[PDB]
Design a binder for this molecule. Structure first.
Ligand SMILES: Nc1nccc(-c2c(-c3ccc(F)cc3)ncn2C2CCNCC2)n1
Ligand SMILES: CCCNS(=O)(=O)c1ccc(N2C(=O)C=CC2=O)cc1
Ligand SMILES: [Ca+2]
Ligand SMILES: [Ca+2]
Ligand SMILES: [Ca+2]
Length: 347
């Protein structure tokens, strides 16, 4: 294919002539994104140019990680790949990676900002998050930083999870993070993401951030004001003695009845929130269980809530050289098989 060059976000993009009318639509994890028109199919796409993918051992493994993950994700509520390309003609020239997915116009913050959502609409939005989470969790993939800005949404309220790192190479919101993540507790499970769903859903119902803490201690205090002081057994999860002593020293707070907090909400929504927003992560409802909850009765369809194929993450424990990660990434670019344009059939 013929490539052309265009300066976007102050850097040269080099893309096949198949993709036209590129214009920036913001940054993603380790990359920046442009909307484009795919002249082969007439579809609107988003193209992410990875930022400096092989600049360091951290970037190189992150690049491989992201490409492997996105090549595996095949679910209507999870960002996956229509195409992956590089202007490189060989491994020796290979320094840039572009990922292509269907264009989504907005994020969840654009949905709830200027609209009092109906309960039926909130149901649909949360349902889709949970359906996507069931799929990713079934492949032993945890998001760990689920939040409205990591939920891409189109003009019809269809939603996809994205941006789901080992090493430190921007100030992120922590308001949606599970307590065990935010405070670095020693162990956690897939239900970290269910806490985040609870935080998101609460905000869709009230129009207000549930736990808008100014720092991690203020956020913890806001959380405990809602869910109540936890037992000693939760201290078992916390390595730092200073942290444990502090939590233990706090004045004891009762759990609030969520029906007194979410005034006017559908009682089924309140019940679901009670099942998601619990500190005991082993008692937190799972994504698959939440999909069966009566709150989603009008959307739930067990024939259309699939799980993922097994996902081999053994590479995560390996230290390889930068050129080895680069070569493996090149292999994954070259081996990518685009999906059919139409992959769905009437039920
Ligand atoms: N507009 C739009 N549409 C779809 C996805 C994205 C996208 C991607 C991304 C990921 C993989 C890929 F192959 C192509 C793009 N990464 C971050 N974003 C965000 C850009 C700003 N927030 C909303 C989504 N943006
Ligand atoms: C963070 C809650 C603090 N309490 S609040 O800000 O006053 C409040 C705001 C909105 C609601 N609500 C629902 O729950 C459903 C419809 C609706 O109006 C309830 C409470
Ligand atoms: Ca259906
Ligand atoms: Ca079809
Ligand atoms: Ca069916």
């Amino acid at each position: 294919p013929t490539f052309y060059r265009q300066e976007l976000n102050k850097t040269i993009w080099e893309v096949p002539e198949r993709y036209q009318n590129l214009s920036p639509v913001g940054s993603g994890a380790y990359g920046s994104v442009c909307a484009a028109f795919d002249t082969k199919t007439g579809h609107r796409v988003a193209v992410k140019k990875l930022s400096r993918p092989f600049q360091s051992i951290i970037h190189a493994k992150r690049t491989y990680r992201e490409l492997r993950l996105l090549k595996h994700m095949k679910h209507e509520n999870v960002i996956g790949l229509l195409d992956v390309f590089t202007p490189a003609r060989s491994l020796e020239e290979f320094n840039d990676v572009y990922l292509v997915t269907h264009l989504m116009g907005a994020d969840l913050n654009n949905i709830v900002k200027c609209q009092k959502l109906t309960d039926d609409h909130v149901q649909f939005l949360i349902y889709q998050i949970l359906r996507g989470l069931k799929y990713i969790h079934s492949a032993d993939i945890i998001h760990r930083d689920l939040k409205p800005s990591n939920l891409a949404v189109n003009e019809d309220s269809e939603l996809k999870i994205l941006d789901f790192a080992r090493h430190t190479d921007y100030v992120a919101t922590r308001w949606y993070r599970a307590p065990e993540i935010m405070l670095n507790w020693m162990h956690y499970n897939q239900t970290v993401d269910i806490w985040s769903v609870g935080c998101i859903m609460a905000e869709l119902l009230t129009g207000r951030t549930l736990f808008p803490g100014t720092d991690h201690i203020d956020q913890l205090k806001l959380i405990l004001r809602l869910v109540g002081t936890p037992g000693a057994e939760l201290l078992k999860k916390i390595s730092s003695e200073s942290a444990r002593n502090y939590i233990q020293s706090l004045a004891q707070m009762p759990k609030m009845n969520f029906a007194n907090v979410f005034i006017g909400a559908n009682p089924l929504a309140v019940d679901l929130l009670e099942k998601m927003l619990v500190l005991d992560s082993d008692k937190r409802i799972t994504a698959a269980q939440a999909l069966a909850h009566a709150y989603f009765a009008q959307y739930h369809d067990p024939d259309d809530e699939p799980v993922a194929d097994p996902y081999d993450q053994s590479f995560e424990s390996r230290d390889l050289l930068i050129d080895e990660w680069k070569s493996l990434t090149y292999d994954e670019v070259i081996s990518f098989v685009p999906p059919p344009l139409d992959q769905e059939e009437m039920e």
